[PDB]
Amino acid sequence: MDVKVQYLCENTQTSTQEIKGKFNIVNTGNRDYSLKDIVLRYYFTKEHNSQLQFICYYTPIGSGNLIPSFGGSGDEHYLQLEFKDVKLPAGGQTGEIQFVIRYADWSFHDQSNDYSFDPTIKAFQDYGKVTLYKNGELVWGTPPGG
Ligand SMILES: [Ca+2]
Numbered sequence: 219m220d221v222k223v224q225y226l227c228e229n230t231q232t233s234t235q236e237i238k239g240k241f242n243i244v245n246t247g248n249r250d251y252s253l254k255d256i257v258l259r260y261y262f263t264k265e266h267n268s269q270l271q272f273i274c275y276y277t278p279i280g281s282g283n284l285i286p287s288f289g290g291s292g293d294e295h296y297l298q299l300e301f302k303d304v305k306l307p308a309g310g311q312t313g314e315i316q317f318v319i320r321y322a323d324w325s326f327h328d329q330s331n332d333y334s335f336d337p338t339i340k341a342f343q344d345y346g347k348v349t350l351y352k353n354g355e356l357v358w359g360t361p362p363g364g
Contacts, residue, residue, distance in 0.1 A: 220247040221256060221306070222358045225345035230337035232330045237262060237319040241299075242342055243350070244311040253279070253301035253312070257351040259289075260297045261362055262319070262332035269322035272297060278313040279304050293333070293362050333362045 222244050229238035241258065245251065264270065272286035285300040297319055306312065319327075329335045334347045349359035356364070 220249075220357045221245050221251070221350050221352065222344055223258065223348045223350060224342040225334075225336070225348055226339050226342050227335065227337050229329075233326050233328060235320055235324050235326055237317075237327055237329060237332070237335070239317060240342070241315040241317060241348065242311055242313060243306065243315070245306050245308055248308050250305060250307045251352070252303045253283070253306050254303040255352055256301060256306075258299040259349045259351075259361065260299075260317070260319075261290075261334040261347070261349075262295060262297065262327070262329070263293065264288075264295055265328050266321055266323075266325040268325050270297075271320050271322055272299075273318045273320070275316045275318070277315040279315070284315070296334075 224242040224244060225239060227239045229236055270288050274281040274284055283302040283304050285302065287298045289298050290296050346359045349361050350357050
């Protein structure tokens, strides 16, 4: 009855320099939004202190309209996506948001200890391990320990 996330996994290897997959944010409710009001989080544990980097090679909403950051710590750590003011109508969707998370020094992740990693999902499906927040509330998904 509100926005939700679909996910698929591209890089399925435990050990990799790039976490890689796609998101799709679908507005299933009756209210149009601006994406500027929506926060997405993909939870993963960082194995290194090198700078973490987000890269989106394609999305229909334009990659320049994404505002990536990293937050939390330990088992609460995540990639966060925020957005510029891009309207997302009721019934609409972003379409694919490709994502890669890598280190500036090209260090290897261990994905096996990442809460949001699911290598068995190769086609988009509604996915509760990536969260959305809006208006200070959790509106989609379950965060770690949540
Ligand atoms: Ca990890």
